[PDB]
A and B are shown apart, each in its own frame.
With several copies, the nearest count.
Chain A
C-alpha cells in the first residue's frame, strides 16, 4: 500500500512554504543572471543529474554558487516548482524546451509526463517537428508512435518545410519503410527529388543511398536526366555510377497501393455467443468478409464517419455498467487503418446515443444523439477540431428531432428528420429552413452523392425513395426498389464507385436473411443488379448495424474464420 498520507501533505506544503519564503537555502542556481535559491534535497528527488552534481565529490560539492548553463529560466522554474509542488502546468508551446531541460537534467518523472503530453499532441502540422525532436533525443516510444503517424501524414501533405531539414538516416528509414500510404509510387519519388534538389552538393553523397531504397520502376525512367541537370559540373563518378547501379534491390510493390473501396460494418451479430456484437466488412472487389477490431470496450450505439482523407472516427455510445445495464459515455476514439486498433482521442462534452457523425471543412460534426442534458436546447450539436484536438459548440438546430440522419453537401450540413430538414451554414453558424417532405418516414439513412440527397427507406422500412436537389430545393419521387413481397428489407444508402448503390438485406417468411446489392441508375431512375452477395461468405449481421464507405488494407486485416 502506501504510508500516512496526512503527514505526506503536511511536509509537502511546508517545503513549499520554505521555498517561497527563502530561508533554508544552501545552494543557489545561477542561470543567465537569475537567482534560484533552493535545496539539495528537492533537486535530488526529481533530477538524476543533481545526484551526480552534489554527491560526487567535485568542486561544486562545497561550492554554494553554481552557474548552470545551456538551460532556460522559465523551464528551470517550472521544473523546480514541480519538484516543490508537483503542479506540472504543461501548455502547448513550452513542452519542446521542457523536454530539452528534462533530458539535460535527467528528470525521469517529468520526462514521462511530457512524453505522455507529446503522445497526445502528435498531429498533422507537427508530425515532422516531433519526429526530428524524437530523433534528436532518444525517445523510441515517441519516435515509433510518431513514425507511424508521420508515415501516413507525410504522404498526405508532403509539403511541410521542416521535411527539408531532416537527417539522412531518418529519411532512409521513412522512405524504405513499408507503411507508407500512397495511391501511387510516383509521389514518394518526387518528394525525394525535391528533397535532394533542396540543397547543394551535400545531397550528392546521400543520393546514392536514397535511390537504393526506392523501387527500380522509376530509377530508369524520367527523374534521372533531371538530376544530371543538377549534377555538379564534370562529376564523372555519379552519372556513370547510376548508369550501371540499378540492377539489384528487388522491385516490389508497396503497401499504400492496397486500399480498396469497402463497406465497413459495425455492431454486427457476433458469431460466438460469448460476445454481444462484432465488427466486420464486405469487400465489393475481393468478394470476402474481413474481420475488424471490436469497438473500444464494446462501445455500442455509436456513429461512424469517413473524412475525405479516408479516416474513421467513433463518437458517442454506451458501455455496460459494472439483466439490463448500460451507461452512456462521451469517449472518442480513432481507428488505425494499419495497426487494426482504436486509438483514444479527446472525449466530447456530453454523452451521446447513436450520434450522426458528419465531416465538413475538416471538422467532425455530431448532430444530436440523445444527449444527457434534456434542457431547452435538447440537441447539443458540437463540432470537433482535427488540428487542435478539441471540441467547439456550434449554432443549435431549430427543432428538436429524434432518430435523424445527416449528410454533407456543398460544404454545408444537411440533417434530415421525419418530415423536416434544416441546412447549417458553417461560415455564418446559422440554420435555414429547407423543403418539406410529403411522407412521414423515420429510421432511415441517406447518402450524399454529388449535389443531391437520396433519402432511402423509412418508416420495418420500405422501398420509398425521395430525391432532394440542393440547387433546386425540392423533394421528388423517382421509383420504388423492386423487392420480394411479404418481406422486410433493411436498406442502407451508400456511395461507391462513383455511383449510388444500396445495401439491402431482405428476409422472407420462415426464411433466412438474404444479402444483395443494387446499382441505382441516376438518369434512368432504376435499380440495376450490380452484384449478388452469396451467403457462403457473409452471414447474418443483425438489425442495428451501420454501414459506411471507406478504404482499408486487406494485408493488415485478417479473414474472419466462420462457416458459410
Chain B
C-alpha cells in the first residue's frame, strides 16, 4: 500500500505550516509512513503533543517513540515519558475544566442562549485540547441548539466541520458546509473557508471533479487556514484534481478565471509547470515532474490512496490528448514522448483501447498507432440489422408466450 522509503521531506516547514490537532495527526502519519525519518518526526511530534495537555494519544506516541529509540540502539551497534507530567497534566486539566464546567452549569441556571452556546463551544475547545473528540461534539452539539444569529450559525458550522474531520465524519462536514452556504443569502471572506473545507472533505471522500471545482473557487485572501489544510497543499490538491478531471479548455478557463489559483500556482511552481506542460503537449517533462511530485506527496494524509488513482487518471488523460491530433502516430515517437519503453507503452495503449476513449488501432509491425475513424453508416446498418434480428426473436418469444397462455399450458 503506502509506508514507502524516500528521503528529502522538510519536516520543519510541514509541521509549522499546520497547527492544532491537525498538525498532531500530520506528524503521526508522517512518522508512521516515512521510515529512516520516523525518529525526528516522532521526537518533534511528542514535543508538541505534550503541549495542550493530551492524554491518550500521548501514550500511543510515547510508546512509538520508545520503540523507535530502542530500534536506534541496535542498528549502529527508549525515552522516559516523565510520568510527573501525568500527575501535573491531570491535576491542572481537571481543575480548570471543573472551574469552567461550574461556570457553564451556573449559566444554565441563568438561561442565556448565547452564553450557553459560547460556553459549550469553550467546553468543546477544551475537550479537543484534552484529546476528547466525542466529548467536544456533545458540547458542540449542545451549542448548535442555542443559536441566535447568522454568525452564531456560521461558527457552529465551522466547529462541527473541524471536529468531523478528525472524527472522519465527512458527511457531517458536507452537511454543515451546505447549511452554512445555502442559508445566508448565497472584506470578511467567510465563504472561502467553507469552500476550502468542502474541497478537502470531498477529496478525502474519493471525489475529484467537484473537489477541484470547490478548490478552484477558494480565494487566496483566506491566507492562514492551518486548522484544516495549508495553502501549499491546497494548491497541490487543486492542481492534481484539475489535471485528472478538467480537460484542456476546462483547465485553461478555470485556472485563469479564478485568479486565485494563479497565486496558488505561484506557491507551487512544480504543479504550475506540470499543468503548463500538459497544455503545451510536453507530457514527457510533465510526467517526470509528476513522479517527483509522487514521492513528496504520497506521505500526505488524505492524498496517499487518492493520489495513486489521481496519477493513474493523469497518465491516461495525457495519453488520450497526445494521440488526439495524430493520424499516423509512430509508437516510437509516442514512446519517446516519455521515459517509458516501447513495450510498456504498447501495453498501456492496448489497455486504453480495451477500456476506450482513445479510439485507435495498434500496428505492431511498424509500431505506429493509427487512429480509428469508422464509417457511421456501416455501423448504423450493422446494429440496425442486429436490432431487427433481436426484434424478430422477441416477437417469436411473445407469440409463443401468447400461444401457451391462450391454451392454458403450465406445470401443475
Q: A residues near B, CB below 8 A?
A: 1, 3-4, 87, 326-328, 351, 372-378
Q: Report how far A327 CA is from B49 CA in the complex, Å.
A: 8
Contact A378-B224, Cβ < 8 Å, known A326-B47, A327-B47, A373-B19: yes
Q: Are B19 and A374 in contact (CB-based, < 8 A)? A: yes
Given A1-B102, A1-B105, A3-B102, does the pair A374, B226 have CB atoms closer than 8 Å?
yes
For the complex, give the distance between the alpha carbons of A225 and B102 in Å: 66
Q: B20 near A: Cβ within 8 Å?
A: yes
The contact size tier of chain B is 10 to 19
Q: Determine the distance from Cα of A326 to Cα of B79 in the docked complex, in whole angstroms.
A: 13
Residues of A within 8 A of B98 (CB): 1
Asked if B357 is an interface residue, CB under 8 A from chain A, the answer is no
Judging by beta carbons under 8 Å apart, are B51 and A373 in contact? Answer: no
Q: How far is the CA of A3 from the CA of B99 in the complex (A)?
A: 10
User: Considering only CB atoms, which chain A residue lies closest to B49 in the complex?
Assistant: A327
Can you offer 16 A-B residue contacts whose CB atoms are under 8 A?
A1-B98, A1-B101, A3-B102, A4-B102, A87-B102, A326-B47, A327-B50, A328-B51, A372-B19, A373-B16, A373-B20, A374-B20, A374-B23, A376-B224, A376-B225, A378-B224
Q: Is the CB of A327 within 8 A of B227?
A: no
Q: Which residue of B47, B51, B98 has the most chain A CB atoms within 10 A of its CB atom?
A: B51
Q: Which residues of A contact B51 (CB under 8 A)?
A: 327-328, 351
Give Cα A374–Cα B128 distance, bound, in whole angstroms.
14
Please determine whether A374 and B47 come into contact, CB atoms closer than 8 angstroms: no
- What B residues does A377 contact at CB under 8 A? 224
CA distance A71 to B98 in the complex (A): 33
Asked if B101 and A373 make an inter-chain contact with CB atoms under 8 angstroms apart, the answer reads no
Smallest CB separation, A374 vs chain B (Å): 3
A443 to B101, CA, bound (A): 44
Q: How far is the CA of A144 from the CA of B145 in the complex (A)?
A: 41
Q: Would A374 and B227 be within 8 Å (CB), given that A3-B102, A327-B47, A328-B51 are in contact?
A: yes
Complex CA–CA separation, A377 to B101 (angstroms): 28
B224 contacts across to A, CB distance below 8 A:
375-378
Q: Which residues, 90 to 104 on B, are CB-close (under 8 Å) to A?
A: 98, 101-102
Query: Do A373 and B226 touch across chains, with their CB atoms under 8 A apart?
Result: yes
Closest residue of A by beta carbon distance from B20: A374
Q: Can you add 12 more A-B contacts, CB < 8 Å, to A1-B101, A327-B51, A378-B224?
A: A1-B102, A1-B105, A4-B102, A87-B102, A326-B47, A328-B51, A351-B51, A372-B19, A373-B20, A374-B19, A375-B224, A377-B224
Q: Could you say which residues of chain A place their CB within 8 Å of the CB of B227? A: 374
Q: How far is the CA of A93 from the CA of B222 in the complex (A)?
A: 45
A94 to chain B, nearest CB (A): 20
Q: Which of B2-24 contact A (CB under 8 A)?
A: 16, 19-20, 23
- Complex Cα distance A378/B230, Å? 13
Nearest-neighbour CB distance to chain B for A220, whole angstroms, equals: 54
Give the complex CA separation of A462 and B19 in angstroms.
Answer: 33
* Residues of B with C-beta under 8 A to A327: 47, 50-51
B53 closest partner in A (C-beta): A327
**List of A residues within 8 angstroms of B102 by Cβ:** 1, 3-4, 87
